[PDB]
């Protein structure tokens, strides 16, 4: 099935690989691009899996969702009509994009520009993109809890996880979310709405003092926690899981502070591990500080190999070495890698943006280096802007309920100016003052 040689080989069938395939086709008319994806599904966007897909009857089957504005769209980047078969890819006139699903690259030979698949098939390439993303992390407490507890714990990542958890939300009475990040908070709000109509229970616990405590300042993290609680969620901050067992058929969670939580199903949203397995056979460098494949500003690792997406630890000429795990970063970095695979030699320059929605009432947008450990200055009026500072310069911005102004935030971080009064900068976001 898989051809023996392909000009462009994209490893992984996710957001970064699809953006690169589109970029290659637009930069090199007639290009022949092969995507090798271990998932049986075609490339699809994941943000809807924890948001729009939950705010709707046949969605689990159609996988179509209504944006907050109303326009309906599919979760897949393109219908199967957009793609060509891997068998006909070398022969179709003016080429195309093919996806080899259900196949995993298990070995990478950088010297001979060759990969070996899980079925023994070997494919030679001229240009290669590694876009393997990552796999959800699991807490050690669940790992030493036995098959019973582990069979009742969901690692939310793929379309299959959305379907399995959606079915469980209609069968069990209590679901517990372990994780205070954006994923855990969005799932809490989503399951919260589901539970308000079915009269069930949703619990979210995490070690921080409030939701997204590692991202937003304390005063805003606490505000967000109250918003999640008002969505029908029992939020337990300052909770460190000590052990997990079964008691009376239900899962029993023991916290390091003595508290106990009884539930029927657990959803662990506790971060991501970059998929760097191919670094061994390929002799590729892994970044010790951020994880992932270490690449340069052009996202290049070796002469004919690039890395994009969650798995790429790259050099930001403006902000320093980073590894970003955002949907728009996978699109931007994937688009950039695609251009550099066709001879662009362009560095990461256009800063990708981040967003999060906790329902159609609360909305976040972020750009740059956003970390609660950095010094912050917030200007609010409901809504506001939070500046993240380093060396008296704005390196990150979080827009709270402020939309259609990301270009202004991007320009601020690019100019790298030392602003005397951040209140005047807040006026740029139509805001007319806290610190941490
Ligand atoms: C539920 C959910 C909600 C999200 N919501 C948001 C949001 O609201 N805003 C936001 O900014 N970001 C969000 N994100 C993050 C965003 O989806 C990720 O940053 C993005 O999907 C990363 O794209 P990627 O191509 O780097 O990796 P992935 O999307 O993980 O794609 C990698 C693909 O490659 C496959 N693969 C891995 N190794 C191999 C191999 N050796 N051979 C073949 N195939 C392989 C993997 O199975 C996977 O199919 C969300 C993520 C999830 C899971
Ligand atoms: C770090 O980026 C992410 C990774 C995984 C999930 C999400 C999510 N649900 C919302 C926003 N960002 C996410």
Query: Could you tell me the residue ranges of all domains in the chain?
Result: 5-43+82-135+273-341, 138-270, 362-435
Q: Which CATH number fits domain 362-435: 3.30.479.10, 3.40.718.10, 1.10.8.80, 3.30.390.30?
A: 3.30.390.30
Structure determination technique employed: X-ray
- Protein residue closest via CA to atom 1 of ligand 2: 325
Resolution (A): 2.2
Q: How far is ligand 1, taken at its centre, from the CA of residue 323, in Å?
A: 14
Alpha helices (H) in 257-346, listed in sequence order: 278-282, 327-341
Distances (CA, A) of 123 to 1, 96, 128, 420: 11, 17, 11, 57
Residue of 103, 82, 21, 31 lying closest to 309 (CA atoms) = 21
Any known ligand binding at 226?
no
Contacts of 177 (CB under 8 A, 6+ apart): 184, 187, 188, 191, 202, 203, 204, 205, 266, 267, 269
Q: DSSP label at 343?
A: T
> Atom of ligand 1 at shortest distance to CA of 309?
26
Q: How far is ligand 1, taken at its centre, from the CA of residue 15, in Å?
A: 6
Any known ligand binding at 182?
yes
Q: How many whole angstroms separate alpha carbon 265 and alpha carbon 172? A: 8
Q: How many whole angstroms separate alpha carbon 338 and alpha carbon 293? A: 17
Residue of 184, 188, 190 lying closest to 213 (CA atoms) = 184
In 3-state terms, what secondary structure has residue 60?
helix
State the distance between the two ends of the chain, measured CA to CA, in whole angstroms. 58
For ligand 2, is residue 326 a contact (CB within 6 Å)? yes
Any known ligand binding at 172?
no
Distances (CA, A) of 144 to 33, 102, 259: 43, 30, 20
Say if CB 133 and CB 310 are below 8 A apart. yes
Say if CB 314 and CB 348 are below 8 A apart. yes
| Sign of torsion over alpha carbons 101, 102, 106, 107 | negative
Radius of gyration, CA atoms only, the chain: 22
Q: How many whole angstroms separate alpha carbon 200 and alpha carbon 173? A: 5
Dihedral over alpha carbons 34, 40, 43, 47 (to 10 degrees): -150
For residue 151, with 0-12 CB atoms within 10 Å meaning exposed, 13-18 middle and 19 or more buried, which class applies? Answer: exposed
Q: How many whole angstroms separate alpha carbon 220 and alpha carbon 208? A: 13
- Tally Cβ neighbours within 10 Å of residue 256: 12
Say if CB 310 and CB 272 are below 8 A apart. yes
The ligand placed nearest to the CA atom of residue 131 is 1
Q: How many whole angstroms separate alpha carbon 52 and alpha carbon 278? A: 34
CA atoms within 13 A on the CB side of 407: 1
Say if CB 65 and CB 39 are below 8 A apart. no
- Protein residue closest via CA to atom 8 of ligand 2: 183
- Tally Cβ neighbours within 10 Å of residue 283: 11
The topology under which CATH files domain 138-270 is FAD/NAD(P)-binding domain (3.50.50)
Question: What DSSP element (H or E) covers 73?
Answer: strand 72-74
Contacts of 127 (CB under 8 A, 6+ apart): 7, 8, 9, 304, 306, 341
- Protein residue closest via CA to atom 50 of ligand 1: 47
- Protein residue closest via CA to atom 9 of ligand 2: 183
Q: Which CATH number fits domain 5-43+82-135+273-341: 3.40.50.2300, 3.40.1800.10, 3.50.50.60, 3.40.109.10?
A: 3.50.50.60
Residues having CB within 6 Å of any atom of ligand 1? 11-17, 36-39, 46-47, 49-50, 104-105, 131-133, 156-157, 183, 275, 278, 309-310, 325-328, 330, 354-356
Q: How far is ligand 2, taken at its centre, from the CA of residue 292, in Å?
A: 17
Q: How many whole angstroms separate alpha carbon 246 and alpha carbon 148? A: 8
Q: How far is ligand 1, taken at its centre, from the CA of residue 44, in Å?
A: 9
Contacts of 111 (CB under 8 A, 6+ apart): none
> Atom of ligand 1 at shortest distance to CA of 43?
49
Provide the residue count of the chain: 436
Any known ligand binding at 183?
yes
Q: Which residues have a C–N gap over 2.5 Å right after them in the chain? A: 56, 381, 432
The ligand placed nearest to the CA atom of residue 77 is 1
Q: How far is ligand 2, taken at its centre, from the CA of residue 310, in Å?
A: 11
Say if CB 416 and CB 389 are below 8 A apart. no
Q: How far is ligand 2, taken at its centre, from the CA of residue 183, in Å?
A: 5
Contacts of 289 (CB under 8 A, 6+ apart): 321
Say if CB 33 and CB 24 are below 8 A apart. yes
For ligand 2, is residue 156 a contact (CB within 6 Å)? no
Residue of 418, 436, 425 lying closest to 375 (CA atoms) = 436
Q: How far is ligand 1, taken at its centre, from the CA of residue 170, in Å?
A: 27
Any known ligand binding at 327?
yes
Q: How many whole angstroms separate alpha carbon 185 and alpha carbon 119? A: 39
Question: How would you classify the pairing of strands 105-109 and 64-66?
Answer: unpaired
Q: How many whole angstroms separate alpha carbon 351 and alpha carbon 110? A: 30
């Amino acid at each position: 099935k898989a051809p023996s040689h392909v000009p462009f080989l994209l490893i992984g069938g996710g957001t970064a690989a699809f953006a690169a395939a589109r970029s290659i086709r637009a930069r090199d008319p007639g290009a022949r691009v092969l995507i090798v994806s271990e998932d049986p599904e075609l490339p699809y966007m994941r943000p809807p899996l924890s948001k729009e897909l939950w705010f709707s009857p046949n969605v689990t089957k159609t996988l179509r969702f209504k944006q907050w504005n109303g326009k309906e769209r599919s979760i897949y980047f393109q219908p199967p009509s957009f793609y060509v078969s891997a068998q006909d890819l070398p022969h179709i006139e003016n080429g195309g994009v093919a996806v080899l699903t259900g196949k995993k690259v298990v070995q990478l030979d950088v010297r001979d520009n060759m990969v070996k698949l899980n079925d023994g098939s070997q494919i030679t390439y001229e240009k290669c993109l590694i876009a393997t993303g990552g796999t959800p992390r699991s807490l050690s407490a669940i790992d030493r809890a036995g098959a019973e507890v582990k069979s009742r714990t969901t690692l939310f990542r793929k379309i299959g996880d959305f379907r399995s958890l959606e079915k469980i939300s209609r069968e069990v009475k209590s679901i517990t979310i372990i994780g205070g990040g954006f994923l855990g908070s969005e799932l809490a709000c989503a399951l919260g709405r589901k539970a308000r109509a079915l009269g069930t229970e949703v619990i979210q616990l995490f070690p921080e003092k409030g939701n997204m405590g590692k991202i937003l300042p304390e005063y805003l993290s606490n505000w967000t926690m109250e918003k999640v609680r008002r969505e029908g969620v029992k939020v337990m901050p300052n909770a460190i899981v000590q052990s997990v067992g079964v008691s009376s058929g239900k899962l029993l969670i023991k916290l390091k502070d003595g508290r106990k939580v009884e539930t029927d199903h657990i959803v662990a949203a506790v971060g991501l591990e970059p998929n760097v397995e191919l670094a061994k056979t390929g002799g590729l460098e892994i970044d010790s500080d951020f994880g992932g494949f270490r690449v340069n500003a052009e996202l290049q690792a070796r002469s004919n190999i690039w890395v994009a997406g969650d798995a790429a630890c790259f050099y930001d000429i403006k902000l320093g070495r980073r590894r970003v795990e955002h949907h728009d970063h996978a699109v931007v970095s994937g688009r950039l890698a695609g251009e550099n695979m066709t001879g662009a030699a362009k560095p990461y320059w256009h800063q990708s943006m981040f967003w999060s929605d906790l329902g159609p009432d609360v909305g976040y947008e972020a750009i740059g280096l956003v970390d609660s450990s950095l010094p912050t200055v917030g200007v609010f009026a409901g809504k506001g802007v939070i500046f993240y500072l380093r060396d008296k310069v704005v390196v990150g911005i979080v827009l709270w309920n402020i939309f259609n102004r990301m270009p202004i935030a991007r320009k601020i971080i690019k100019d790298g100016e030392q602003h005397e009064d951040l209140n005047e900068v807040a006026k740029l976001f139509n805001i007319h003052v806290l610190f941490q």
